[PDB]
Design a protein around this nucleic acid. Structure first.
Ligand SMILES: [Mg+2]
Ligand SMILES: [Mg+2]
Ligand SMILES: [Mg+2]
Ligand SMILES: [Mg+2]
Ligand SMILES: [Mg+2]
Ligand SMILES: [Mg+2]
Ligand SMILES: [Mg+2]
Ligand SMILES: [Mg+2]
Ligand SMILES: [Mg+2]
Ligand SMILES: [Mg+2]
Ligand SMILES: [Mg+2]
Ligand SMILES: [Mg+2]
Ligand SMILES: [Mg+2]
Ligand SMILES: [Mg+2]
Ligand SMILES: [Zn+2]
Lengths: 141, 59, 85, 184, 71, 85
RNA sequence: CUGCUGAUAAGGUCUUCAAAA
RNA sequence: UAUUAAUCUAGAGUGUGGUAGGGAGUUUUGGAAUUUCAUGUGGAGCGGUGAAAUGCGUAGAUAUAUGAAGGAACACCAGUGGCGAAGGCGAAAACUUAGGCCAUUACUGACGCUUAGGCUUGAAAGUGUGGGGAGCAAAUAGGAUUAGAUACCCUAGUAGUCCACACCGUAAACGAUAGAUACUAGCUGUCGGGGCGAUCCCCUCGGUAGUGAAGUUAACACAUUAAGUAUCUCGCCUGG
């Protein structure tokens, strides 16, 4: 796939993606691109699994020195998205660590909470099933 | 600001002299009372904006 | 329900049955209005006027008063709102 | 550097002022390249300076180091024969890099040719030039631009990982909400 | 009435450099009948060429080539 | 102005290397010397003083980085340039 | 077409209500 | 996430190539105009105001023409503008010098953002020493107006305004909006670089403006140069 515009990204990997997603949702935009990091790749994989996005697709330069991830939002026929809001918890500076006992439940289970405990990012329900917790990245509902 | 009468008629000479005296009197009255540099700049910009809007509406 | 002949300057949200069309050409507006009237007239059962018709009966003329000019002009009558002190 | 002196000398006699200019040249200009001189002529200058109405104008196109100006500048005023003088360093004038640029020179020559052709057509000898198209706009855009338009560097990317791609295509926005009128 | 023939002459010429002893008669056209630099509305040049012409004309006026206040 | 070509050819660690930290700091030292000369001569030009302070700070930051990483090259650079004191 | 042109003791009503016809 | 051992170029710099600027300091130069002085013509007022009066004038004023001296500020260009971090920068030139924009198949390889404390600059007024002083004018004197006028008006007028060197370090020092980074409709101008080659106009990258939906707001309004979606760092606020 060929591009024309330069691609930049913020230094904060969770909130960069969150800002991109929120702006695309508010502006009804469908496809967005950003620089690819492995945390972002895993988080997009779990978003696609949970069904908040249509597809995410990683690409590499011809010299294998740069990688960028482009993803599309899942709009219905009447063009209203599945994402309703995003809020980041573990911002730089103040990192949020919660044990299993205090693993949050987002919107009474309607939304999902992204938790990167020890096996990569992990949804709240599967984290509860595994009885182990860790860093809490963002709230998506 | 010399204007030649041309000895053909006189009203034409006054018709041009009216203008020449008008754009002369503008600067003559500008250099009569002392205003600060900022106030003088404000007055210049105001005159320029008035002329600009008049020309925009007349063109 | 409201149907309309949107002409590139309309808000699509307000109209339900959008008909992308011209609004400045007295031939295009006539053709589309008569097509809607043809739908109405066929439903209420008289013979149609423009719909389901050949060229010899669809043909129309251009009102009086090279090619037709659908160009929007007269921007000079849009001055800055009265301001300044 | 590359300088340009404009000397203004009293209008007594042409040979004597030529000697005056030669002396002023050979005295100062400590470090110098070849000093080419012109002669604009005797001109009745606009306002009377030094109570004189006529003056010889010369232009010097020498070039040299920054020290070449101090002695000449301090001696010109002392010399009673020289009214004024201007050292205009052309390396700081309003547009010098463009003048040295080669492509712009050829482009300027082409503009000269085309503008002269247009002006000749406008001032046709006796036949009437209907268009009078000098200040007005031109014809359709330039096919030379349309062809030689630049191509941005479209960096190519190779697919590595994919997930969820089906390309459903839901490009039906503003779809009608009401479907069929009906009775209770 | 008026005219729309106001275009920067130097833009069409592509002159790209102004020297006071190469187009001296050209600058006298830009100067007012009362020896003033005419504004853009009358002179017709763009901003860059107007600035260049103004600087060159002031240089010439220092060099005593055109008067200051009279014809 | 300073002979940037000569300074670069003197300070290059190898050919085609015109943007290393060593060549940058050598250029910076040359500009520092020139600006100190100019500022001592003038004493009322404050924009030049601001530029001089900015260049001094940039050189200090570059030397801090080159001391943090590959400190032996930092010793080499400092004993060639004699900039510490 | 620009003269001049100053002051006015204290505290105070006035909305009872919609339950409803 | 932090530490350590390394690789990479996309952030940030450097080099080469294009390039616009009233960016800054030092030294010279120029022309209008005011004032004073000198020399001619001339003869009763000039000046000033709402109206006048102090004031200047037969010792020849105002006016007019020529010349000299000196000081300060640089008409027109001059903008629905340019530069700097801010204050600020506009007659001409030279020398020294700061930053910025565009394109980079080049180089270093995270060297970056913010910044308590520290340092640098910082309108005008004011201070100290020495120069300078044309015009203007705090303080001051007089004439008016007024019930009074220590004010508005007028006639004079010192410090000051100007330069060099040292201080002062405050402003409605305002975009009443800290800096950096990523994203989010559009339309109309204008300024610079680059692509084509008469101008004009088209495209790209940036600067500066207007209008304007989503979005925000208590409202006014802001609205890709945000007061919108978010992050980082600093400063600050907690009724009169
Ligand atoms: Mg990281
Ligand atoms: Mg004031
Ligand atoms: Mg009265
Ligand atoms: Mg009383
Ligand atoms: Mg005189
Ligand atoms: Mg002061
Ligand atoms: Mg008194
Ligand atoms: Mg009063
Ligand atoms: Mg007085
Ligand atoms: Mg005192
Ligand atoms: Mg304060
Ligand atoms: Mg200010
Ligand atoms: Mg607005
Ligand atoms: Mg209190
Ligand atoms: Zn031009």
């Amino acid at each position: 796939i060929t591009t024309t515009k330069p691609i930049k990204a913020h230094f904060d990997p969770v909130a960069d993606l969150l800002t991109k997603i929120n702006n695309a949702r508010k502006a009804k935009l469908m496809t967005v691109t950003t620089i690819a990091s492995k945390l972002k790749i895993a988080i997009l994989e779990i978003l696609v699994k949970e069904g908040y996005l249509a597809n995410f697709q990683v690409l590499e330069n011809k010299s294998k020195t740069k990688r960028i991830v482009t993803f599309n939002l899942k709009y219905t026929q009447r063009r209203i998205p599945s994402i309703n809001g995003v809020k980041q918890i573990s911002k730089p500076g103040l990192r949020i660590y919660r044990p299993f006992e205090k693993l949050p439940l987002v919107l009474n289970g309607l939304g999902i909470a992204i938790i990167s405990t020890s096996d990569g990012v992990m949804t709240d329900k599967v984290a509860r099933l595994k009885k182990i917790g860790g860093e809490i990245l963002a709230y998506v509902w | 600001p010399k204007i030649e009468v041309k000895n053909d008629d006189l009203e034409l000479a006054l018709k041009k002299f009216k203008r020449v005296s008008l754009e002369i009197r503008r600067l003559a009255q500008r250099h009569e009372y002392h205003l600060r540099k900022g106030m003088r700049l404000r007055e210049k910009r105001k005159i320029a904006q008035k002329k600009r809007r008049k020309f925009r509406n007349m063109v | 329900p409201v149907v309309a002949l949107c002409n590139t300057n309309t808000n699509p949200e307000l109209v339900d049955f959008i008909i992308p069309a011209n609004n400045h050409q007295p031939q295009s507006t006539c053709l589309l209005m008569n097509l809607l009237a043809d739908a109405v007239a066929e439903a209420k059962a008289m013979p149609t006027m423009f719909a389901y018709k050949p060229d010899e009966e669809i043909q129309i003329e251009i009102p009086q008063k090279k090619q037709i000019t659908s160009q929007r002009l007269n921007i000079t009558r849009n001055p800055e709102v009265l301001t300044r002190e | 550097m590359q300088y340009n002196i404009i000397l203004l000398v009293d209008g007594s006699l042409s040979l004597e002022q030529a000697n005056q200019v030669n002396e002023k040249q050979q005295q100062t200009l400590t470090n110098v390249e070849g000093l080419q001189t012109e002669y604009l002529g005797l001109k009745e200058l606009a306002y009377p300076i030094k109570k004189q109405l006529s003056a010889h104008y010369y232009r010097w196109k020498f070039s040299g180091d920054n020290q070449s100006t101090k002695d000449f500048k301090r001696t010109a005023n002392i010399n009673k024969q020289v009214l004024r003088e201007l050292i205009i360093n052309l390396e700081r004038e309003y547009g010098y890099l463009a003048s040295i640029n080669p492509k712009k020179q050829q482009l300027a020559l082409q503009k000269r040719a085309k503008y002269d052709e247009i002006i000749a057509r406008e001032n046709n000898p006796e036949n009437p030039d209907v268009p009078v198209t000098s200040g007005l706009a031109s014809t359709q855009p330039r096919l030379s631009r349309t062809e030689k338009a630049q191509k941005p560097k479209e960096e190519l990317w190779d697919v590595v990982q994919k997930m969820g791609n089906f390309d459903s295509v839901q490009a039906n926005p503003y779809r009608p909400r009401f479907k069929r009128f009906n009775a209770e | 009435f008026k005219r729309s023939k106001k275009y920067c002459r130097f833009c069409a010429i592509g002159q790209l450099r102004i020297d006071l002893i190469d187009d001296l008669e050209a600058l006298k056209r830009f100067l007012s009948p009362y020896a003033k630099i005419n504004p853009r509305r009358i002179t017709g040049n763009c901003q860059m060429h107007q600035r260049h012409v103004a600087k060159a004309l002031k240089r010439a006026r220092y060099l005593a080539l055109v008067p200051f206040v009279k014809d | 102005q300073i002979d940037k070509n000569g300074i670069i050819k003197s300070a290059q660690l190898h050919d085609k290397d015109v943007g290393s930290i060593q060549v940058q700091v050598s250029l910076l030292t040359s500009q520092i010397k020139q600006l100190t000369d100019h500022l001592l001569a003038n004493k009322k030009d404050f924009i030049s003083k601001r530029g001089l302070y900015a260049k001094v700070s940039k050189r200090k930051r570059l030397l801090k980085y080159l001391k943090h990483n590959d400190l032996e090259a930092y010793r080499n650079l400092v004993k060639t340039l004699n900039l510490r004191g």
